[PDB]
Design a protein around this ligand. Structure first.
Ligand SMILES: CCCCCCCC/C=C\CCCCCCCC(=O)OC[C@H](O)CO
Ligand SMILES: CCCCCCCC/C=C\CCCCCCCC(=O)OC[C@H](O)CO
Ligand SMILES: CCCCCCCC/C=C\CCCCCCCC(=O)OC[C@H](O)CO
Ligand SMILES: CCCCCCCC/C=C\CCCCCCCC(=O)OC[C@H](O)CO
Ligand SMILES: CCCCCCCC/C=C\CCCCCCCC(=O)OC[C@H](O)CO
Ligand SMILES: CCCCCCCC/C=C\CCCCCCCC(=O)OC[C@H](O)CO
Length: 216
């Protein structure tokens, strides 16, 4: 009992951070691989005007690129309409590699938390559900203002942090897909992620309080 205390409490520690990360990764893949937001973006930002492309050309290029970024696509990236340089296809491999590593870690934290969670959950201990929501709502709270007021510079730091080359700044001449990827769209995608993080936090917290009311 002196040791089930710690071990259950280390599992509530390990499980808690894996709840936070799993929500982070899940919200990312939902926004990254979701095409509903970007399809709305095409008319809302008037991307045809921005890129001198048609609504059909923009959709298929985005369709092909999003398909290229899945773990289960082993082919190279060829855009239906736009040409691209070797620097351009190095960046999308960088982006593809980042997504794959987040997803690999995400499966671990999703399993760690579901398996280890139900262990502590059926053992009448829900401390991990409060800690999880607190840890994961730190994300939107810390980053809501950086995106809202300083997106352009937060965007650069983000890229500088995650990429070890210069190729993330696209030359419209050699990589014209940058014209159909406006900065406002990535800003909305960052907001959608944070809303899903915040949504998952509230969801995770709704359970905690609801479960604590069960014990009493
Ligand atoms: C079995 C009786 C109750 C069932 C509970 C099973 C126990 C699962 C344990 C830990 C994970 C719980 C996570 C709390 C809920 C979070 C919901 C979620 O993970 O979704 C995040 C969303 O996908 C982000 O975009
Ligand atoms: C029931 C658990 C609740 C968790 C909810 C789903 C869990 C699915 C089950 C197990 C491993 C986790 C896999 C989930 C990851 C798949 C979603 C994802 O991010 O994949 C993107 C895909 O590659 C874009 O093409
Ligand atoms: C994970 C614990 C520490 C978190 C610290 C990181 C802060 C990032 C915050 C929000 C963005 C979340 C995005 C997750 C990864 C983005 C996927 C990606 O590669 O995007 C490429 C980019 O759009 C090409 O311009
Ligand atoms: C009950 C809990 C209350 C809520 C808990 C707070 C946590 C933050 C949640 C979401 C913020 C994330 C998205 C916020 C960023 C939106 C961007 C924005 O609104 O600014 C527009 C932009 O400046 C135009 O130029
Ligand atoms: C600073 C925090 C904000 C960081 C951004 C939030 C994450 C955006 C994620 C998905 C949007 C849709 C992305 C789908 C794939 C985009 C293709 C791409 O990587 O283009 C990047 C561009 O070339 C480089 O400037
Ligand atoms: C009730 C629980 C609430 C939390 C659960 C949320 C789940 C769905 C949230 C958002 C979907 C995507 C909407 C993203 C819209 C991006 C635009 C934005 O949020 O702010 C940008 C601003 O408009 C710049 O001018």
């Amino acid at each position: 009992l002196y040791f089930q205390g710690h071990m259950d409490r280390l599992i509530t520690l390990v499980v808690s951070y894996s709840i936070a990360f799993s929500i982070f990764a899940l919200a990312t893949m939902a926004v990254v691989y979701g095409k509903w937001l970007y399809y709305f973006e095409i008319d809302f930002l008037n991307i045809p005007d921005l890129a001198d492309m048609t609504k059909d050309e923009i959709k298929r290029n985005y369709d092909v690129l999003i398909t290229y970024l899945s773990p289960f696509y082993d082919g190279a990236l060829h855009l239906p309409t736009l040409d691209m340089s070797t620097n351009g296809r190095i960046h999308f491999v960088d982006v593809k590699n980042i997504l794959v590593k987040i997803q690999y870690v995400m499966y671990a934290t999703i399993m760690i938390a579901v398996i280890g969670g139900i262990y502590l959950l059926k053992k009448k201990n829900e401390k991990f559900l409060l800690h999880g929501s607190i840890l994961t709502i730190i994300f939107p709270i810390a980053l809501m203002l950086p995106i809202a007021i300083n997106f352009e510079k937060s965007f650069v730091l983000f890229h500088k942090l995650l990429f070890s080359n210069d190729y993330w700044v696209f030359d419209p001449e050699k990589d014209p897909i940058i014209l159909m990827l406006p900065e406002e769209f990535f800003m909305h995608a960052a907001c959608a992620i944070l809303l899903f993080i915040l949504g998952g936090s509230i969801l995770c917290y709704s359970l905690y309080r609801y479960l604590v009311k069960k014990k009493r």
